[PDB]
Every structure is written in structure tokens, then in C-alpha cells.
């Protein structure tokens, strides 16, 4: 089940990164909502399924203009703290969007971890088509 690889990636994602927590956000099947069907780290797992607007917010955006970003601060469903914004890419569809997020007062993201971070989001992704297309090859 292609779904299984987001589990992965949350896990893989805060293992990387060492954030207090990690989430992705999916498109359920141009999309108006996103849907959290991953939650790692200090992210409740209450917050599983929550939906999340495409419009007016920097998980949406990223979702929409493909641009890896990092924040100084990110509200809910961040926790306050730094973040990065990892949208997952692959050829013509988004998957969804990968965020690592920090409790307010943690250090900010480097750039060399936001460009560490695109990487594995774009393995990721790949990993993601991958496991999508043997599904529809039965």
C-alpha cells in the first residue's frame, strides 16, 4: 500500500532531522484540502486526518509551487518553532508535503539541512511513484 511509504518518510524524516516532530499532508483523491495521514515525534496523533487547506498557508503553498522552504515559525499544525516545508515531488503530481517542525525558541534550519531534506523528499517521492505504479500494474 503506497500510503505505507508516508509512515516511512514521517519516521525517516525525524530520525534525519532530529525535530521535535514530523507530519505529512496528502491530497485524499487541483485539490482545495490536504489531509495529515502521518504524524511522528511530538506531533499528537490525535492530529492524524486533520485537513488542511491548499489556499493561504505555506504546507498548501508548497504543495502548489513545488519551492522546498524553511521558517522561523510555523502555527498550527507547526508547533510554534522552526520548520521545514518538504514538498514531496515527482514527475507532473505532488504526493504531498513533508514537514518537520520545532517547538518555539529552537535554533532555526540551516540551509545545508533544507537542501539534505530536499534530497531525501525527492527519494521519497520517487519511492512513493514507484510503489503507486507496481499497484496499478495488478
Known sequence: ??????????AEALTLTGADGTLVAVPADAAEELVIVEVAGAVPAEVEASAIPVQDNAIGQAFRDRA???????DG??????????????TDTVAGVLVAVQ?????PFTAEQLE???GFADQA???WQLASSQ???S
Open 68 to 74: 522546498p522552504r524553511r521558517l522561523d515559525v510555523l
Open 103 to 107: 517547538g518555539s525558541g529552537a535554533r
Open 125 to 127: 517521492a520517487v519511492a
Open 77 to 90: 499544525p507547526g508547533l510554534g518553532g522552526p520548520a521545514l516545508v518538504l514538498p514531496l515531488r515527482a
Open 116 to 118: 539534505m531534506m530536499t
Open 135 to 137: 499497484r496499478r500494474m
Open 1 to 10: 500500500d503506497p500510503a505505507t511509504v508516508f509512515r516511512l518518510v514521517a
